[PDB]
DNA sequence: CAGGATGTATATATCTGACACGTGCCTGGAGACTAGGGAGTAATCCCCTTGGCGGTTAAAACGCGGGGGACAGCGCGTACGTGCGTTTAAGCGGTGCTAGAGCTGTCTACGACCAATTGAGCGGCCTCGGCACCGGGATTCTCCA
DNA sequence: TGGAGAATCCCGGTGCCGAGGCCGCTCAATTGGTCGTAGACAGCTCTAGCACCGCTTAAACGCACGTACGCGCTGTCCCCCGCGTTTTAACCGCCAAGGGGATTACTCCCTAGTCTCCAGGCACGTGTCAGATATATACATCCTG
């Protein structure tokens, strides 16, 4: 179909380790965390989509997400309520 | 004063009818099945708070196992257990 | 008759009933979770002395040493993800060395 | 050509702010093309599409932290996805 | 009257007795136990809020925005410690560079 | 029409206790919600697992000054637990 | 004093064990302090579970309960 | 020569290879019970102590330090070295979390 | 390549105390029976999610030139490593003991259950000013001659 | 060194929509009473922890030396950084439609709770054999040749 997961781009990926506060970055880097990322939204999204499927609900409201990132013990702030 | 020793002997005595088990061992694997028995019932718990259902049942433990384990065991024990919930609601 | 052997079960539906009812996680409690849970438990029980005999197997040893436990958890991959923050008693470390360790040139 | 100190200057322009990073519409596709994986035909709603935003963010900038610690350890200003491999490994994800 | 009134707090002892019971974290609960919930909410909102204000006043702000609040756990040793495994929404980055990474 | 339970004017009070010039936003007011519940879960949860440890029904100050020195660094704790007992000390007297 | 008692020997063979061949000399000293600092949080953790229970000894079980506290949950001891 | 000398690295492979084959005793335990006691009587004197207790603190020590030190020798090849230094271990303790 | 030189896998002789089986007494497990409110199911309505197009314009893609960092190699210093003799106190056996954890029993006060009572609290609607945004000048520092 | 320019900080006006504040209604909070039931405490039992004592003995302790690895230096090459033009596609504001979340209303099932009977599960006793230990032998390494 589309790549979708190379919709996001490297300029946003300097600027996300430019938050992270480094100076130089090699080009190899870029599918790599493309991959990582995809995989950390696979172990979030899992449980978003359980959690959407249990309570009668095709539609993710934020709270479930809030759970989910509860459940491996990486919480959010600002949305449970 | 309980344990969980006899059922799990002869579940081993099932699957391998020809070892046995020493008592550190039994320790174990006693201490591996109330962990993962309160493991699995707070997660029963905090799903029947969440949306306001105030009884555990079948659905609400099924989606919980879908959260506990990981993706190949989670189908085969989830199809087992309700082959398993099959089998009583026909007896 | 036992709600086990209804089942076709081997863990206690009763017992795991009442743990689950005075463990306070909810105060109604459905009729088929008790047999859930020991559906659940005993495939889990099965698959760990199926290692565990495995590994007793290929160390001709028939009595199960927690070492037997360490390489049936620490082996399987998706067993490991799922309980890998867990610290087995007397297991030991698997054999792990890597290539750039040992000497060279044989 | 101006060399190096826009990095630095760069650095401090993106670490006082707040605002997001990756752009929302590659993301908002991505959660939808991974979601059509588990339950087709799936609605969300835009709060939990910004706590997947910030959550990878939180998570992204902890990994590249580590990642400039790993390469200060390695006596080197340029990151190298091995240290990706060890910040992974750090946290167990991989073993 | 009231229990807040009467233990002289402002966090409420009848909801937070109310939520601690249908809660059903336990069978049955003693009367001090939502006074000494009240009492730590109390405190820990208390003093994460006067970090908060001390973190707008040297940005010389006077509405609290979620950068603030970062500012307010992220520069202190036991909010680092009790406040470890979070996510804060729209927070920021605490400012920490390498002195290698810095020029000369 | 249904009552979205919250803490927001609550903490409006103490704050403008503490500092009479600030104000607060909703979004700020969200953290501040979230923070505030999560606490009490982590709290009222581990009093229920010291509950359950001394095969008690009965739960009340002790075993929560007890969860006070589990999940709390110890200075804070030992300043909370002087907090909580001058508030339950003050209820308690109140003839 | 005693904590120079886990003796540089028992680090080299903890090594061995954790998969080291070449180990420095200035690793066991600081490797025993921060083995004392996880041992504070432990015991700390130990300490308020026994005095909680009216008991002045420490079991096998509220350590374990501990650990679960730490995240670091260990088994054969019940629990 | 005359007399027999090991080559240094090979009875390093050999302890290696003997330390994770078992599952023996590694820390000495009765010093570990005098650093029991005294962080006991540190905290709160006249204190008793278990025996299946004062293993169990003595074998997640064990599984701490044998966690940490794998990941601080693999830290050790990252950093084109086969020698750990503390650094490595002060990079295991943040990176981890334990310290920050 | 190659020979000897040692640590280690294997092999049976033997011994012991944990491991599994047997007994029965007993406290949970199950059958029977009642009842009431939790939730299944259905119907209503309305927020709120999705789709989609066009002007604007900020941001991405790609090319180019170079200079500074990544890496290969090298050379020299000493740090543990290996192996010997040396010095230490752990470890098993054995026993006295005493201190406090656990079981039993009984009074008691306090907390769940119920009804009734009412204002704290919470959505709804109005008002103003703090701060983001547009625009412009003062201030730093960085790199070139 | 001196000077040009590129961004950052500050400075001023403004307009807005986000926060404050007041208001009306009602649901949870509170006042009051009861009854029983775990909790508090005391008295007794007894287990498990505590603690000295000697003896053989594994293991820690200490030192020599040497080697090969840690670490600084240097040189080279090409990998990203940084700039600029062209291209990309996303923001926002707008308008349409409906699927599905959220709430209400009814009914009945099944699960809480008591009573009664009973047998499986657990404390206790046991005899025995898998596995720990022992010592001689093949074998699979490594080191100088």
Redesign the pocket.
Same mark, same amino acid.
Request: glycine letters at 6%; hydrophobic letters at 30%; proline letters at 5%.
């Given at each position: 179909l589309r790549d979708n997961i190379?919709?996001i781009?490297?300029?946003?990926i300097?600027?996300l380790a430019r938050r992270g506060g480094?100076?130089?970055?090699?080009?190899?880097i870029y599918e790599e965390t493309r991959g990582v990322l995809k995989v950390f939204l696979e172990n979030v999204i899992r449980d978003a989509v359980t959690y959407?499927e249990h309570?009668?609900?095709?539609?993710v409201?934020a709270m479930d997400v809030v759970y989910a990132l509860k459940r491996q013990g990486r919480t959010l702030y600002g949305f449970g309520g | 004063?309980?344990?969980?020793?006899?059922?799990v002997?002869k579940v081993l005595?099932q699957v391998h009818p020809d070892?046995?088990?020493?008592?550190?061992?039994?320790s174990i694997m006693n201490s591996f099945v109330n962990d993962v028995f309160e493991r699995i019932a707070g997660e029963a718990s905090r799903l029947?708070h969440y949306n306001?259902?105030?009884?555990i049942?079948s659905?609400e433990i099924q989606t919980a196992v879908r959260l506990l384990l990981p993706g190949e065991l989670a189908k085969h024990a989830v199809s087992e257990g309700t082959k398993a919930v099959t089998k009583y609601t026909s007896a | 008759?036992?709600?086990?052997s209804?089942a076709g079960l081997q863990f206690?539906?009763?017992?795991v009933?009442?743990?689950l009812?005075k463990g306070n996680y909810?105060?109604?409690?459905?009729?088929?979770a008790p047999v859930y849970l020991a559906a659940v438990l005993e495939y889990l029980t099965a698959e760990i002395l199926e290692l565990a005999g495995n590994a007793?197997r290929d160390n001709?040893?028939?009595?199960?040493?927690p070492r037997h436990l360490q390489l049936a958890v620490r082996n399987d991959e998706e067993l490991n993800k799922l309980l890998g923050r867990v610290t087995i008693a007397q297991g030991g470390v698997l054999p792990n060395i890597q290539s750039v360790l040992?000497?060279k040139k044989? | 050509?101006? %060399?190096?100190?826009?990095?630095?200057?760069?650095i401090?322009?993106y670490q006082?702010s707040t605002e997001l990073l990756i752009?929302?519409? %590659?993301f908002q596709?991505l959660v939808?093309e991974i979601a059509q994986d588990f339950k087709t035909?799936?609605?969300?709603?835009?709060?939990a599409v910004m706590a997947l935003q910030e959550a990878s963010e939180a998570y992204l900038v902890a990994l590249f932290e580590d990642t400039n610690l790993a390469?200060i350890h390695?006596?080197?200003?340029?990151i190298?996805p091995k240290d990706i491999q060890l910040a992974r490994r750090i946290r167990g994800e991989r073993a």
């Open positions: 190379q919709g781009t490297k300029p946003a300097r600027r480094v100076k130089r970055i090699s080009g190899l959407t309570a009668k609900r095709k539609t409201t | 004063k309980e344990s969980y020793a006899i059922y002997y005595k070892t046995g088990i020493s008592s550190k061992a039994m029947a306001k259902r105030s009884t049942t659905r | 008759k036992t709600r086990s209804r206690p539906v009763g017992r009933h009442r743990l009812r909810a105060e109604r409690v459905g009729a088929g007793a001709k040893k028939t009595r199960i040493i040992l000497p044989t | 050509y101006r %060399p190096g100190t826009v990095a630095l200057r760069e401090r322009r006082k752009r929302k519409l %590659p596709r939808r035909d799936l609605r969300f709603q835009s709060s390469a390695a006596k080197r200003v340029t190298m």
